[PDB]
Amino acid sequence: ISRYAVPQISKLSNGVRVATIPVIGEATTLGYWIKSGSMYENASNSGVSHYLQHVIFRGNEKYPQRKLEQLAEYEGINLMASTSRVTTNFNATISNDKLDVATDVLSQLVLNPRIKKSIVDNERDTILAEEYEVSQDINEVIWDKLHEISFKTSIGFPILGSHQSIQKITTEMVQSQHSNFFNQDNLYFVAVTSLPHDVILKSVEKATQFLKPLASHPKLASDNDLHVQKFEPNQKQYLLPQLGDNAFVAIGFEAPSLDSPLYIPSQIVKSVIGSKEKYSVSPLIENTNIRTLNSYSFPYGNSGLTAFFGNESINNLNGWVNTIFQSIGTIFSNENIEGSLNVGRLCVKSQLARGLSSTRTIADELGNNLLLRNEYMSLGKWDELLNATNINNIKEYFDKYILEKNASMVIISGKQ
Amino acid sequence: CVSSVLPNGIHLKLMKGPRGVCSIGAVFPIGSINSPKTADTQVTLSSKLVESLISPKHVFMHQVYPFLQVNREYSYLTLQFLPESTTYAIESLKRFLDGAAPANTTFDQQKQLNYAAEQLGEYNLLEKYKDLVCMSSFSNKSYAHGNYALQGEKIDLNPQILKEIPKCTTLVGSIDMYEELVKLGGSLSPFPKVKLHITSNFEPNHVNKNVKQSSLQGSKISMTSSLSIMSLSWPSCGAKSVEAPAYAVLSKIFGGGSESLLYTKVVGGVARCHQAYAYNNFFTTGGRFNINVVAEDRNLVKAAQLVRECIHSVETIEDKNLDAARGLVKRFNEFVRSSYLGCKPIYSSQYKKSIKEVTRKAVEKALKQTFSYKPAVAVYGPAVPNEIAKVFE
Numbered sequence: 001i002s003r004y005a006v007p008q009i010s011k012l013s014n015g016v017r018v019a020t021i022p023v024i025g026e027a028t029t030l031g032y033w034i035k036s037g038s039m040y041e042n043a044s045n046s047g048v049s050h051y052l053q054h055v056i057f058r059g060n061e062k063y064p065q066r067k068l069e070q071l072a073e074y075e076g077i078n079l080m081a082s083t084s085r086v087t088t089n090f091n092a093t094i095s096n097d098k099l100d101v102a103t104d105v106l107s108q109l110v111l112n113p114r115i116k117k118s119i120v121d122n123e124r125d126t127i128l129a130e131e132y133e134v135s136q137d138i139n140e141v142i143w144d145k146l147h148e149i150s151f152k153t154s155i156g157f158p159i160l161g162s163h164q165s166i167q168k169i170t171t172e173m174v175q176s177q178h179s180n181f182f183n184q185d186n187l188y189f190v191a192v193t194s195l196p197h198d199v200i201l202k203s204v205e206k207a208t209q210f211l212k213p214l215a216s217h218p219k220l221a222s223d224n225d226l227h228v229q230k231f232e233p234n235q236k237q238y239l240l241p242q243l244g245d246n247a248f249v250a251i252g253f254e255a256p257s258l259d260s261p262l263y264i265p266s267q268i269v270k271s272v273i274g275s276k277e278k279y280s281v282s283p284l285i286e287n288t289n290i291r292t293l294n295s296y297s298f299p300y301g302n303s304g305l306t307a308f309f310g311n312e313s314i315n316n317l318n319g320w321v322n323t324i325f326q327s328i329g330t331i332f333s334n335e336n337i338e339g340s341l342n343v344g345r346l347c348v349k350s351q352l353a354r355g356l357s358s359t360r361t362i363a364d365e366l367g368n369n370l371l372l373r374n375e376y377m378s379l380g381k382w383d384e385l386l387n388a389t390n391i392n393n394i395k396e397y398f399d400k401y402i403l404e405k406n407a408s409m410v411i412i413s414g415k416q
Numbered sequence: 417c418v419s420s421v422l423p424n425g426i427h428l429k430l431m432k433g434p435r436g437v438c439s440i441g442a443v444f445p446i447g448s449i450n451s452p453k454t455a456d457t458q459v460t461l462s463s464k465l466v467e468s469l470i471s472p473k474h475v476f477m478h479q480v481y482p483f484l485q486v487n488r489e490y491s492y493l494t495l496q497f498l499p500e501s502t503t504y505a506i507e508s509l510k511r512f513l514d515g516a517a518p519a520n521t522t523f524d525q526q527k528q529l530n531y532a533a534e535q536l537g538e539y540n541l542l543e544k545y546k547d548l549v550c551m552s553s554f555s556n557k558s559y560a561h562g563n564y565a566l567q568g569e570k571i572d573l574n575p576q577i578l579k580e581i582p583k584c585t586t587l588v589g590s591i592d593m594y595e596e597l598v599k600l601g602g603s604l605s606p607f608p609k610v611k612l613h614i615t616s617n618f619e620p621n622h623v624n625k626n627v628k629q630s631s632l633q634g635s636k637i638s639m640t641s642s643l644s645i646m647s648l649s650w651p652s653c654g655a656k657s658v659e660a661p662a663y664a665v666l667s668k669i670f671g672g673g674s675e676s677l678l679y680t681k682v683v684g685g686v687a688r689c690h691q692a693y694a695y696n697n698f699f700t701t702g703g704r705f706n707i708n709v710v711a712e713d714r715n716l717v718k719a720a721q722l723v724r725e726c727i728h729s730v731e732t733i734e735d736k737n738l739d740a741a742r743g744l745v746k747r748f749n750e751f752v753r754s755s756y757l758g759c760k761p762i763y764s765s766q767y768k769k770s771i772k773e774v775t776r777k778a779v780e781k782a783l784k785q786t787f788s789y790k791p792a793v794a795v796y797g798p799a800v801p802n803e804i805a806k807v808f809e
């Protein structure tokens with residue numbers, strides 16, 4: 001649905017940048033992408049980015065909670081938001097005729113909140129509950145433990161905040177995070193749309209009429225260099241006897257930053273191991289009977305984490321670990337390096353192609369690209385880079401990141 | 417959509433829309449009811465599917481996303497891929513339509529996965545609702561055959577249904593797979609079989625699937641594994657009916673959530689009640705409107721009373737509510753689902769026309785004819801079903 005090149009960016013005199021990319025279709029995804037998340041927090045305000053996201057959604061003056069509900073129910077404006085370790089967005093997916101109401105609400109909520117003790121305190125329980133829910137998905141739990149033992153720095157915080165943190169978050173903290181991270185210069189408004197650029201631009205201008213320009217530009221709190229991350233491999237085991245005859249396991253390595261020449265290779269290697277699904281497993285895996293497998297690799301400022309995880313029966317856990325290590329090893333062998341690269345490259349192209357049919361997916365990618373990249377990377381240039389990636393690029397990623405490196409490991413066991 | 421009929425009688429149905437991801441598949445009137453017992457069909461088609469793809473490694477290496485959906489009266493297979501994988505996808509679809517029984521060793525593997533379905537996260541609440549509705553609201557006892565075996569029970573390979581697939585297959589695919597499918601269907605034998613498929617009559621039976629749930633389901637320590645599920649079924653209409661939009665609307669009025677009337681009066685109303693949802697299930701010739709409640713075993717009767725209280729409430733319903741409902745109402749999978757049923761796809765321009773076009777007449781009419789019946793009552797758990805049934809008079 002996207003014709004595989006380039007977005008168009010304009011800046012309003014109030015300093016809001018409006019980035020749109022053209023798409024065919026009835027559908028439009030739009031909103032605000034802000035460089036706000038748990039990487040930019042410290043021990044004392046951990047959890048606050050996510051907390052703020054909730055408050056923002058709980059309505060402001062011109063739109064209380066009630067008028068937001070009405071807008072879902074009758075006027076077809078569905079508000080989505082989320083907070084990762086690195087970024088935050090508030091968005092809606094709409095029909096083109098709903099443009100003005102959408103840009104109005106979104107600008108109002110994100111850029112014009114009313115952060116009062118009563119909404120803050122009233123939100124606490126919701127966030128507590130969400131934290132309980134999330135803690136009963138062991139994949140989430142193990143993900144988080146693996147970060148925690150690998151990073152002494154802010155990446156090792158959970159996104160939601162520790163239980164104690166969620167309990168101690170004050171209205172002052174929520175205010176401050178908004179004041180420091182939600183400014184024109186730390187965000188973009190994004191639109192994936194058939195409508196021309198200028199129509200979105202004019203709509204956002206109408207919508208942001210209340211917003212006064214910034215007098216100065218104090219160095220962004222979201223700056224990567226104010227949050228240098230330090231990976232240190234660690235090994236830690238947990239009980240959860242309610243799991244019964246099962247264990248979860250995760251194995252982590254440091255991964256490259258988003259701009260490293262070795263990033264793409266890292267993506268190829270992870271992809272080639274990939275995930276085991278109902279009908280598909282990596283040629284690299286010797287025991288295809290393993291219960292499950294996931295592979296992720298993320299950039300975090302200067303650092304990043306590649307992680308492999310799943311669950312097996314207690315009897316099968318230690319085997320699972322051997323399988324995963326073998327599989328990685330297999331890639332480095334000269335009998336295999338070339339097939340590994342081509343299959344990994346194919347995987348990455350295939351993940352791409354799927355993301356290019358949903359405006360929601362295009363939006364998220366465009367938002368993150370703009371906020372997290374040095375220079376905007378085209379779907380175009382990206383393809384070139386993948387294709388130009390050779391056996392020696394893979395060999396080199398292995399050298400800097402894998403061979404002779406200790407991995408982090410977390411086990412969560414039912415009996416052990 | 418673009419219908420065709422082939423030289424040899426084979427129907428072929430194409431999804432319009434953009435290029436990028438390629439789609440192919442087969443849909444056919446063989447479902448779980450066409451095997452002697454639960455899981456028989458499921459495991460047979462799974463075995464056949466896994467042999468057809470050669471190995472999970474081939475699947476992976478070509479980046480093919482296979483999907484197999486076995487329903488009561490019908491089933492479908494879909495494959496999604498990038499254009500450079502066309503040959504493997506087409507050949508794998510061909511092998512699937514070749515009538516040959518899968519080797520026992522494969523069956524035994526698939527049996528293992530099937531028995532472990534709840535633990536692996538393949539047997540969620542949606543799947544349990546369907547099972548509960550199908551073992552309770554049919555005059556025919558064959559509808560009680562689901563896809564997921566009980567721990568105590570046998571599962572056998574059904575080689576006859578494999579011979580039958582090619583003889584009743586409609587082919588489905590994205591528009592750009594026209595040429596490739598025309599040739600594939602070309603290879604199937606003339607002419608497709610024609611059976612009369614009549615969905616079984618409504619019966620308000622009372623049943624229990626009184627079975628332990630796994631603690632761990634997929635990667636979740638299930639927050640519902642100790643609670644019971646109560647399914648209440650009433651007859652509605654077939655997918656092709658002109659009343660089907662009215663019923664979709666009626667389901668959203670009832671609505672529901674976890675932690676709309678089912679939310680407010682039922683999830684709010686019984687403390688220690690995880691969730692309450694109303695769904696509308698279509699079949700070849702009939703429907704089942706069903707309301708499902710996850711609550712403590714001892715709380716089910718109270719919950720039923722709140723649902724009866726809830727049905728009552730729908731007569732005196734405002735236009736604010738009646739507009740919210742109209743509002744509130746792997747896209748290939750919907751194209752295929754709605755291609756068999758012969759209706760309009762949930763995403764199509766024509767379907768959302770219908771939803772705008774439902775009168776208040778239509779809704780109260782649908783309500784009246786549906787709730788005129790004594791509900792069928794099923795329990796995932798030990799709750800006495802006739803007790804809950806008593807609530808309805």
Ligand SMILES: [Zn+2]
Nearest residue numbers: 050053054130
């Ligand atoms: Zn949240």
